[PDB]
Point group: D3
Chain length 266, copies 6
Amino acid sequence: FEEINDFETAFKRLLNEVLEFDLQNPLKDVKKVLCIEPHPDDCVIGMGGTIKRLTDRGIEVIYICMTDGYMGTTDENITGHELAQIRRKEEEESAKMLGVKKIYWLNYRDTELPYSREVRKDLVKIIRKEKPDGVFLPDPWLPYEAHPDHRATGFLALDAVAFSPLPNFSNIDLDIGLKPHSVSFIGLYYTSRPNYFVDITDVMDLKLKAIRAHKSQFPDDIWETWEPFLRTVALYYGQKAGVKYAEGFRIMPGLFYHITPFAELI
Amino acid sequence: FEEINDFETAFKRLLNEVLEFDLQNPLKDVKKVLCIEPHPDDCVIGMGGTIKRLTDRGIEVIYICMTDGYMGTTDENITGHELAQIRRKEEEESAKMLGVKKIYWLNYRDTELPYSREVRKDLVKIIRKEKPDGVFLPDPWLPYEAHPDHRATGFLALDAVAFSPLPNFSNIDLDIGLKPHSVSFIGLYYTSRPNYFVDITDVMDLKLKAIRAHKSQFPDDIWETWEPFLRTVALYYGQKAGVKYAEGFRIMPGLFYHITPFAELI
Amino acid sequence: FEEINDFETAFKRLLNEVLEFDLQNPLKDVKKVLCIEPHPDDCVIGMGGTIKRLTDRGIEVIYICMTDGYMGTTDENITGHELAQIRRKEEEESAKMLGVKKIYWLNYRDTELPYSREVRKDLVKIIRKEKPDGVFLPDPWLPYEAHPDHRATGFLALDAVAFSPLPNFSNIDLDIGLKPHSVSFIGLYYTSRPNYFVDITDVMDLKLKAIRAHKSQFPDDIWETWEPFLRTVALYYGQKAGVKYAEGFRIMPGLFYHITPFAELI
Amino acid sequence: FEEINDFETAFKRLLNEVLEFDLQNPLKDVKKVLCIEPHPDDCVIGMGGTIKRLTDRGIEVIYICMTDGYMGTTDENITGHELAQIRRKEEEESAKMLGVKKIYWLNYRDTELPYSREVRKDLVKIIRKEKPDGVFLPDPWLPYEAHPDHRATGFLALDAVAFSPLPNFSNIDLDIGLKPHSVSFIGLYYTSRPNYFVDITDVMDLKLKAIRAHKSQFPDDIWETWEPFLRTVALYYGQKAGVKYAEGFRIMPGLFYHITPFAELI
Amino acid sequence: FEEINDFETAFKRLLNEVLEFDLQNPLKDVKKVLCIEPHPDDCVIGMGGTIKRLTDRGIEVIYICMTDGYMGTTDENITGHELAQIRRKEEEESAKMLGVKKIYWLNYRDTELPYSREVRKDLVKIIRKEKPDGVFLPDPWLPYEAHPDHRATGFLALDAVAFSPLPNFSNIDLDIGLKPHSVSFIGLYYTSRPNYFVDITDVMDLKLKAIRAHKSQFPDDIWETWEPFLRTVALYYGQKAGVKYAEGFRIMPGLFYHITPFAELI
Amino acid sequence: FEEINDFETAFKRLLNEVLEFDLQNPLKDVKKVLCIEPHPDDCVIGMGGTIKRLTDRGIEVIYICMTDGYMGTTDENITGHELAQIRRKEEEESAKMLGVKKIYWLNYRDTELPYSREVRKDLVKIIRKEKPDGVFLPDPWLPYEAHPDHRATGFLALDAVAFSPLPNFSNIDLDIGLKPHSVSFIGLYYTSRPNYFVDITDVMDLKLKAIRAHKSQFPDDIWETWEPFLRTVALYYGQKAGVKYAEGFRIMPGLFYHITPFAELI
Ligand SMILES: [Cl-]
Ligand SMILES: [Cl-]
Ligand SMILES: [Cl-]
Ligand SMILES: [Cl-]
Ligand SMILES: [Zn+2]
Ligand SMILES: [Zn+2]
Ligand SMILES: [Zn+2]
Ligand SMILES: [Zn+2]
Ligand SMILES: [Zn+2]
Ligand SMILES: [Zn+2]
């Protein structure tokens, strides 16, 4: 590689020959994935269509939900305890409509999710137990994301995936018979720099039915705003992918999440 | 909205019809605003002109100052306790010169402002009490902002505004008779992605006199650097707005601060 | 400066006359610098070539390593305690090969570096003791940096530099006879927005030998991936600087790290 | 007082003349008290009889409950969210049976109550709003108390009472129009060093009915153990007070909670 | 129990009939116990003899060590990383000499053991996996215990035992197939209020050989002080039990660790 | 020591021969001591008399004050910043009246002193710099001490003394040329289990003048209560020592602060 005198060549060779990074079929071998959502309803809102598509193709999809959704209401007659119970039933209904069979609830309180070692260990435990091929998580670099649970979940999910294979990390996991694990695939959903698209034209009406199942979050008057907003998001991704309705994801080789100044160039 | 096949149309309709988002007069009905500053002098440096303009138009402007300014000196003869006392008198003088009548001091120590639930609750209490129509806060995504108190204040102010209307958030506030509150208007000051401008050509000399009132922060020799820097900032904003001297703000609909991949497009 | 009617003029004058900012020879008077690395091997990987060039020019280079490298292995036979010992010897060998004489080990555990006042005070102590002219640190705004130790180190280094000269900050340092200190020079390594380059075509094979000295981190099979990745990075910086192999740095005047909306413009 | 040469005399004079400390009728003027409980059911279990006696005498009793009781079950079919909802209804029933009209729920999670400034501020807010004459709280020095929520509540309640009257403590409370407040009376319940007793012979069957109202906590099989345990506690206090069934409290002058080496002598 | 009019009767019946509390053989059915030690060497120093006695009787003894022993040296030539490696080998040798076959290392750093939910979860995981009949832990109420790791370990071990059987506590443990678990037996070692004794006259020379195996901690000159100190401790316990050399333990019914004012009476 | 068959003998030998523990003159070689106080005025109130006696005997006494005294007023007209300034001047006057030359201010805020590694390191730095022979600190086991700053200071002081001599603890101190340090002498003031007394009948009126110097803390009406309280405390210690007025201290050999079940027996 000392032979090479020009960046684009080196870059092309690094990606294509050295890393063998494929953006055309990057879910080739994947049989099990984790979707990590900050609140009940985030998996379905950000990639509900893709989830349905994967379950139909007989890929096993497992949700990890970081919080209980305790705060998500303006109704003074509903306690956070009542609302958590409700949003558990709602995500159970929603997850059944897409093919999703298992949900792990971390049960950190909505608005109170720590960026801490503790939460890294909670995720690394599940990854080591379920040995998934791929993990989906919200992009922590989404510009203007003011929800701290969202930002946190992103960094934690990356940290967890990064540390799952390190046997000195959360070592009691090994001592009780969980083996360390490398994930093959990482995809960021809720991203503004997607580089992989999935047509959801055919499943858009199911996706919206699975979102609406979260009745607590979507009364008629809120739905007036959110059905348009969601169709607009699907068109934004759609236009880039040459279809009506798409879901955007950012997929990179693991190496590019660390000390890569040209990471923004894929 | 199923009717729509292209993004730009959907985008235009979302902004114009669904959200009714106005960049021509977004302060229409605003009678009271909060300006949140990390240190004494930040409201005046970032939007002192706009504050004067608002008070002249008979709009009530209330400062929330996050810290005491304990660290802001190189003089070995001044203790942090002395400096805090001084910077309280300075901001009191400065605030009088602009039309500003109330300041809340959180009194967290300069350089030690936590990114915590506690501080969210301190802000949400004031918002519920003062029921402001609009809130101004420093842009936390300002590139190359190395002051941790600045970054923190931005995220906290957004969190506070987002959570003020949720009755299960800091619920003791309700139990002692503070009602939940929605803010109509959010504006980010100290931003590099402004999309709303205020002419301060006419109030620039008052703005500089109100900055200079912070004598502790601005001895003659420091002022040699800072009067130029401030004129340059006002020109940068000015050029974009077609005037000599402007203050820039980023204003978006509340919806766009959460899971909006096209947020950077306004 | 009231005279000026256009931004670009004011900008040019602010940079050239007021701030005297020089990008052609910014290491004029620099005799002593600190290189702050999150892990053992980060100084060598991010600016090993530049460090050699500085040593040869008789500039004193001191490493501060934030963590012990406890987690950096997939081998189930190596404890984090064994690995820390090993990576100490490796960085000692690597530091010998470049001209580096002194290493401070903070010994926070890999993956567990706090963003806290405590760690700010640990750095400020070293800066006040060594009174360095310049500090190098990894760019905390590097896009897609998922390693929390990296993000943390960047913000802490800037905080430390900013607070070293404040006598009310960590005041016990003064009480035991460490004087406050201003550093002249700040340079961000591992950056995607570099604006200063150093030719390392001549030292590239030494740099790779000094990286390979970290045997724990770079077995044959991993080096198949990392020798290409590093040549590609050096070309990326190289293309921008018009040479084969360069190391990129971002250098700005201290003022631009605070409330500067045109900071992105240098 | 320089006249005095013997401790017992000075001690007697300090208590009787200087402090005017009365153990015979120490609730003389009290019209409003707060009972602070770590979990739902702690007020009723530790002093349910005394509460009834006070409400019958037309004294206003307000509960502050620190936690939600999320963890208090071995039943794998009940979520912490369900159980919190349930224990809210149970304490509402229980509190109605005794004369208690108002409950504030802090809603910190069972087993997760922090010993933090935040929680001190939550209590000081309620004290300043309700201006109670007296506060009851569990004795933090109860030997062999392994429940961390119990230990925590005790220290926090004392801290809160101590800091309620300090206008520089949680100063935003004052800024929104809560005046500082001194409590006249402090009583520790769940104590092993009681020095004031209340006959509950006449209300013991109501106390047990109000405990049993917490059905979640007291199934038939658990009640086999807890009816005896509670009768035994009431006899232990009873024997000391010369009655069948009593509730023990430790009452001291505020001064004795700080730097008093003979505090254990009342 | 309404029948009873005097405490001593009720107390006797509570202990003997209701709780069936046995101080003659409280290890009756115990096949597996956990010994929790703050540092390498604490299990052997506090109850090494008892451990030997248990392994000879074919009872399975598992150590949980909370910290790595990083700080335990005055030798400036030994890093904390070197010392941890050493103290791992030492406790492995020591544990072999007593019958002990499993050690779990939490690897929190010596002097830095947090009193946190995280550490509770680490212990509860091991308890649920190993389903021990009994747990030994240092008495957190030991007067004049200044080592914060000691105090912490005590409270944490009690918390862990208390919370192991609650399915809503660390619920991910259940989701990955660890069942909740109740411990039958709790014994506090390093206690000044022991109420159960074990003769170690016959195993005292093995106990001292197993202590001495921690060479790092016990050079000749330190052993001059510690062999006497240990013989003195064994006599103190011995005198109370009517033997030369004993190890003291405090054993109570689980009920007495919560809201029991007469707990100090057994 | 195998020879010995009885505890009291072993105990006597351990104390007298092995540990050489002297309660008759335990300040033999002491030339320099630290007095650690949680608030300004705690050294003077707890051992002001003893301090004068030590100064007169030409022993160097250095105050470490943990907090700034920010909260200590009921006056709504005084800010915590004003009060800290004032209490600095007051402790400077008070310290002059006794022979005290040097005060280190940690400047943690009153009511907000952390029990953290950070604060341990702040104390260990001062101890290593001043190499004192002895340290005085408030007894953290003082029954009914409700002030969290007091409890915290005690544990921190002991931790600091324990860890000062460990070169792997706060190792950057060594890297900047502070040597590790063992203190010879530890004495607990504000204790209810004193075992060493100092006659202060001769200095009692100076002690009261040095307390009264803290005017902020002691207006006429408060002094009506505090002059009696202090005379009573001095008599309590006095009676035990067979004098009118004494100051009590608890002194033990360093070994007894760790795993010593008979520590209560001296
Ligand atoms: Cl662990
Ligand atoms: Cl497709
Ligand atoms: Cl506050
Ligand atoms: Cl009565
Ligand atoms: Zn969400
Ligand atoms: Zn600022
Ligand atoms: Zn690194
Ligand atoms: Zn309870
Ligand atoms: Zn230990
Ligand atoms: Zn005090």
